[PDB]
Amino acid sequence: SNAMTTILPNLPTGQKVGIAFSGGLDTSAALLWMRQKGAVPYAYTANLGQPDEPDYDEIPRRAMQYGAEAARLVDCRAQLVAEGIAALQAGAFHISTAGLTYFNTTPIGRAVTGTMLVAAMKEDGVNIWGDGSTFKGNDIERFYRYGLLTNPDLKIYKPWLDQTFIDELGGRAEMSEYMRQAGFDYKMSAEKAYSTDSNMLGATHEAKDLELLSAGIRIVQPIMGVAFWQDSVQIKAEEVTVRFEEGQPVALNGVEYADPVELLLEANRIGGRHGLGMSDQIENRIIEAKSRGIYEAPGLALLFIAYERLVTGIHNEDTIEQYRENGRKLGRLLYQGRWFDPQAIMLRETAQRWVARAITGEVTLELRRGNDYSLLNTESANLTYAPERLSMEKVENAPFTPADRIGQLTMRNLDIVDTREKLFTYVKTGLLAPSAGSALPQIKD
Amino acid sequence: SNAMTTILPNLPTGQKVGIAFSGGLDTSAALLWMRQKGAVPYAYTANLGQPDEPDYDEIPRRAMQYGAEAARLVDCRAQLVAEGIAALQAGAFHISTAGLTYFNTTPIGRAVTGTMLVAAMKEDGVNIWGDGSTFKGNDIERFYRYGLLTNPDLKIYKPWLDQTFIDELGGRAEMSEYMRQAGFDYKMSAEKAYSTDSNMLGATHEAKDLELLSAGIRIVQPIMGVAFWQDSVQIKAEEVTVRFEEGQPVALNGVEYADPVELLLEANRIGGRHGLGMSDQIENRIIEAKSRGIYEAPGLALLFIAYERLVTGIHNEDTIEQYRENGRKLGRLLYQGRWFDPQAIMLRETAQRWVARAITGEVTLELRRGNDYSLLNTESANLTYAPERLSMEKVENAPFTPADRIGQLTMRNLDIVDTREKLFTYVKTGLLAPSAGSALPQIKD
Amino acid sequence: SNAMTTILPNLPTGQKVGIAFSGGLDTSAALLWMRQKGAVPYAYTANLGQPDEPDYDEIPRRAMQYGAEAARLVDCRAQLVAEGIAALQAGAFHISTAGLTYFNTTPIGRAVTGTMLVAAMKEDGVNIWGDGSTFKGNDIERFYRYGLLTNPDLKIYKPWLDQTFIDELGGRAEMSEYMRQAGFDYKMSAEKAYSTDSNMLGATHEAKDLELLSAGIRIVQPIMGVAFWQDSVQIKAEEVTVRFEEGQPVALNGVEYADPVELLLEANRIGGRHGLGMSDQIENRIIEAKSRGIYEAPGLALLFIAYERLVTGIHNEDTIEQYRENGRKLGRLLYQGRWFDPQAIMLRETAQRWVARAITGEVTLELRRGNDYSLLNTESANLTYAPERLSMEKVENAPFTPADRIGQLTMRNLDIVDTREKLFTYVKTGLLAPSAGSALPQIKD
Amino acid sequence: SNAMTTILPNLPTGQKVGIAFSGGLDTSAALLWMRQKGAVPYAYTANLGQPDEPDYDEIPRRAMQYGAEAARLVDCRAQLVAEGIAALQAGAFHISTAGLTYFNTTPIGRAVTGTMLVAAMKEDGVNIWGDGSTFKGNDIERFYRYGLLTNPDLKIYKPWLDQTFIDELGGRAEMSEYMRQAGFDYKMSAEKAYSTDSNMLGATHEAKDLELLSAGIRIVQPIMGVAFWQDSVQIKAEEVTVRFEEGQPVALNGVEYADPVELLLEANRIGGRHGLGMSDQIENRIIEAKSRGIYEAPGLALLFIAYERLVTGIHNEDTIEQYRENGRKLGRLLYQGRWFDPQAIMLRETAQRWVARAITGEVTLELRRGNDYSLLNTESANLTYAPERLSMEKVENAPFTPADRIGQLTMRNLDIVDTREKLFTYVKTGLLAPSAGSALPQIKD
Ligand SMILES: Nc1ncnc2c1ncn2[C@@H]1O[C@H](CO)[C@@H](O)[C@H]1O
Numbered sequence A, B, C, D: 001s002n003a004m005t006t007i008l009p010n011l012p013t014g015q016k017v018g019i020a021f022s023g024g025l026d027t028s029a030a031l032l033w034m035r036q037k038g039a040v041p042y043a044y045t046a047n048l049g050q051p052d053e054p055d056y057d058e059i060p061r062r063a064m065q066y067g068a069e070a071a072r073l074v075d076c077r078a079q080l081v082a083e084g085i086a087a088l089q090a091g092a093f094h095i096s097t098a099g100l101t102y103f104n105t106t107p108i109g110r111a112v113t114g115t116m117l118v119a120a121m122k123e124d125g126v127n128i129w130g131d132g133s134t135f136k137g138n139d140i141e142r143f144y145r146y147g148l149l150t151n152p153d154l155k156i157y158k159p160w161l162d163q164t165f166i167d168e169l170g171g172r173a174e175m176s177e178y179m180r181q182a183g184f185d186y187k188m189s190a191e192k193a194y195s196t197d198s199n200m201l202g203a204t205h206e207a208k209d210l211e212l213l214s215a216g217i218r219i220v221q222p223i224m225g226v227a228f229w230q231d232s233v234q235i236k237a238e239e240v241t242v243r244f245e246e247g248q249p250v251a252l253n254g255v256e257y258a259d260p261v262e263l264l265l266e267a268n269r270i271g272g273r274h275g276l277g278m279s280d281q282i283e284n285r286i287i288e289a290k291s292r293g294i295y296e297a298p299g300l301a302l303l304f305i306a307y308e309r310l311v312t313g314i315h316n317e318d319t320i321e322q323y324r325e326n327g328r329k330l331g332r333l334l335y336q337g338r339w340f341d342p343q344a345i346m347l348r349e350t351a352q353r354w355v356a357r358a359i360t361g362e363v364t365l366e367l368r369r370g371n372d373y374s375l376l377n378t379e380s381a382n383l384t385y386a387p388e389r390l391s392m393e394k395v396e397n398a399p400f401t402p403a404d405r406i407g408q409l410t411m412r413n414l415d416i417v418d419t420r421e422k423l424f425t426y427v428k429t430g431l432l433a434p435s436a437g438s439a440l441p442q443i444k445d
């Protein structure tokens, strides 16, 4: 080991140690433990607009009760929405099943907190991050990378590498006990059949009973919308308009939003009433092993429909093709924690400039249950869709004549003959089966 | 002009002329007109398992009443399903809107009839095809290519290039009159606000009122399913199991199908009861102008869900990535009429072999209305999804340790520093905006 | 036909007609003919820095002798070099044979003259271009597109569609005669075994004897360099330094160039003395038929070596991969005449910004004959190549330890087992042949 | 730590340990040391047709002198050539500088020895490989993967993790001393300013003085060819013919080769006399850090020219595009040690079937010095290059007319107008700079 080794396996006694303080059991016990053992902890709670968080202000207050040197709320909502919109603009979603898309809400979230919490730590003179992200997940890598990109002098302390931490804490029962012995009644929540990670872009549910592919969405109580699959849940058809100005979502139902955070919060409400955007995916972790999740993203799903519809009516085939190619590649880079790397920047800026800036328009749709919806109208001054330009009603307005089309067809013949000749060559070399045959099963070569 | 000139602008009097005889007004009047003018027409009606065709046998019988020299039914169902399954296996679908996919059912249909009807014509000594496909659509090019690939000596007569055809026929009122004057009361079907093309893979609706983006699925009476968007339409939730064996769909609801045509007919019934698979798309025609359609494909949509789900649980990330890249490229080639060209064969065979052959398994789902469904179970002996291999419960079974993961992280540092340095270089050259700023809007460079 | 039909098949008598006046036989005879027949011709001669053009000023003077209403020289050199540099920066070259690259000098040239000559015509109130580009080449399409993009009201008159032009002119002997009968002794050049098209980016040789693949570079007298393959040609080894600043070539042999045109002219001289950059290619024309050429581009070949070398020492693997992917796609768009279309802009700007702006450095090489050269040095403050950062000499400076690498390897096991299991599955389904076998040829399944 | 832990940090005393015995100082001392310490070593020497190996038979004989339990020569030449030919067919080369290509000869070599030596070990009941491949290179990962794919029960002992090995051996002086103390005067070869790895596909030189980019090919004494850059080296121009049959190289200079190993040995001799194929590359290692090499591959370079030339004359543009796209992706997978993984198989088989099987023909060239050569002839019954099919000499043979081409142009107008309108939209949103300007530098927005 040396001075520039990033990972610290032992608690840095007497030093300032930053903690991404969500206020759950793990971070609460860790913070208390770090103080007890001699470190000086600084708590940073990310305000991510979590749909299941009732009161962010209460969290720093508990950090101080547990002995934090300082505790603050870092507002990450604006950035989260801006990165979410950038991902949307670039179609940066690589996880999908028969078209149903996962909007990479977890990786976007990590890109935001990994950079913003480390920067907040740096401003307070905190160059050590006591990051509990586990050895078997994706976040250990994402946070490692985002952290070091933000603060080159960052050291990362991994408590689970410290035998004293493993012995005194460990499982949830031991951590819950450690809290109680220090005089803090940690209000243990009612246990669920899965784990949840959330932010205002979306929520992901996985692990525990969701590890079995025989279980699924039926066991999930959604936190950003209703259980649309249950008959007792009454959902009436609802018309919605979504308006974009140069790629930025600016209005919902004719109401203009100067604040994009407020706009996404309203998109979330609209999609949420219908259960729009939920999916079930098997994803490939960074370590090359699969995991399974149930996902929610009602607001982004709503915006995705409108943005895509406009893209298909505004951009040419090659542009749409590059957009989709770039997006799948960018999605994977995002998932790996490389959202700010040069290769990702290239893909991202290309979409923000040449694809998104032309997207000025409005899409009208009807939402019913889950992903059942209908398109009602699509409007844009930038549309290239124009059946009137294809009108052959008058000879004076027709773009081309029947004779012109025949001329175009004649240009295909040379390559057609080349292809037919390839087919015959492929039969002779045994790659393709001959055209003609027998009326009964036949003997092969 | 030249002996190898494909297009004939004049009726070839006294010669054998093939007609793709659907039996609608256009082909009925054309066939009668061609006979009256001296040509010898041969009618070929493609049995495509059309969902709106009540009796295929009656069509050749009418061709003979109109003076056809001969009239045959060419059974294209087996081939249509085989090509549909190949497309499915290769994810050869390039037209989509926010994930909702068009299954290229029209282009697959043309690849089958364009080759099979021309081959049937050749057997009867017919080397001229009186093809009415219009000068402004995609099919004129698709049929031109498929036809010439099948029969190098094929000539194509386009009635609309013949001034005598334009003068005597033309609009539907003139054709309907021509029928009546020849003693045939052509029972014209009730007029619709759109045109429909169909086969057992799917149905497409476009033109007329569907040209307006302010109109949509609401004006369409579906022919392969119910009007799922109307509240008065009662749809009961339904559980379905779909089983694949080495990429081929072999069973539905535990019932094994030796005949793939019968299997797709049942898949169509199941999906049809729910309205599964309908979408609204703006597509890019071969001529680089956009058109709009409302699409149906209930059976293929059902199979796509199952196939995709299995692919995500069986194949590694690079394999899935190549599969999807190849599919979007292949979809476009298919749409262009290049399904049998070498570049298409490459993409297609790759999927049929290395992607599809590993797809042995069964997916269980619940269908509700439209594209609202839930996954209930996923089973396969070929799954690489395996949370038990990730289990750290025993030291003797864990694939890696916490210390091993730290080792992996340390391997990232060199490139992380390179990326951070790129970011600083990009700020200096003015490509990226600086990190730090002011509390109020600031003057830029 | 209608008012917005671009192509005019008849000479527009009494109207202003622009001619891209190169001053060769075709344009000289056409200009004279157009005046004689009543049109009012305006001549525009592109100054392209042609290596075989001794005096551009003399050309407009001849246009006026032939009866041009006006004649001017449009300087296209600055733009030609800027577009050439942009292509270079984006590696926009899709035609190559075993790595030997064609720098798309003809298509770049057409993008420049097609836009610039049409703009010059517009400023003089000339909205008709009498473009002689032939019906069987690529340029007819390129000029059509570039012209209409530049001037939406442009009409293009194609003399070869005019029966009066075909009758009075036609072959070279007839045109040469037409000149003589009008009192102009057109000084007919000594005939060559091939046709040449050139500009300061490069020169292309094709047609006539070069149509035979049994002929090649041996019959070509190069115009931008020496015949390096001939023993009588003495070529001494020469050291050269090429320096870039943020992607722009700025110095050669320590001499800084404020004018990029002068820099390329010197690069051409340096590469030309050695015959650097020549190649033999079979390309695919827009009409899907092949053509063959012998190419020269000594200056661009020199710059390409230096730029590429720097790219490989500065950018990460993913960045280089996107750069090369984008370049091959962009090259094809360029060749089609779509250099200014949105899909091309995307690819081009991406390279100019994220790839090229980091390319600040200097490459030293030794040129011998043809493409035989050696790299002597590569320097750049932006290099990520840094063997000293990989030095394990001191424990205090090593980036990772041996134990760290072992940790990284353990992360591969799960996918390795999945791959081995796929291999066994592929043998069972018959896709792959088993590993073990017999000592003699064996019977198959 | 775990029964399936691959890496062994301690010498397995009393157990059978396989050693890839090249017979250099490192493997000689290691083998002797392992025996002395109680292990039972089995030596396997790969016959790779190394250009610098004078006598393979002498190596096993020395292994036995040093105390090997058994020592065998495993003939890897046939497989090496077959994998080399497969790579060639698929253009699986991703490392290049201005077109000059590195033929991935080291990674191909590792794929062959990593699998073949492990299989040979298994036959002898040896399930432990004492692999000295270092902690900072690529081969540690390649061998790890190839080994485990071949033998799932393989354990890999890394001597450098054993403190007893580090203490007693270590540097070359210590190993050379250990040999002498055991009674073996190891005749150390003359020291070089770089390290070399070789096989009959090619040779790579790197490390030591080649780490400096100010040094290069000038300090290398080539082992597969002459020092073509030195004037004193006399090289006579030489004509060569290379013939392929369905993608397999079968003849050189009219002499047919039934044995591909013999064919490559002759190709190596021909290219070697000229120094054909040498290059200087900066590559990206698996660990995301760069390294520099000087490479030789005269035989493969010769075959690459012929294969590529034939590909350009036989295959259509889309086919060539897919071929090159697939190749760059496959090259990277090959470099990573994933040559036998599913995603690599897909790319590889596609080329072997649809690209290579059509490559039947012969290319004639003249080789001079280094990469300076000329193409003299290209012949193939499969060529699609055919200027006679483009001949407009007779009206009865012309594929299209001038009027037909005009028809084709008219089909471009709609998209041209869409693109022009995009350009105006991009100026309005500030993405593109306006067309018109001032005669002097102007104030911007
Ligand atoms: N036409 C296309 N060609 C290749 N890849 C495409 C295309 N369209 C979209 N993609 C996407 O490219 C991704 C990776 O490049 C794939 O996941 C695929 O979905």
Ligand SMILES: Nc1ncnc2c1ncn2[C@@H]1O[C@H](CO)[C@@H](O)[C@H]1O
Pocket: C321, C324, C325, C326, C328, C329, D320, D321, D322, D324, D325, D326, D328, D329
């Ligand atoms: N890694 C890669 N994957 C795919 N295509 C690539 C890669 N590198 C370069 N290319 C280029 O992409 C082009 C078209 O996309 C091909 O002509 C090919 O040369």
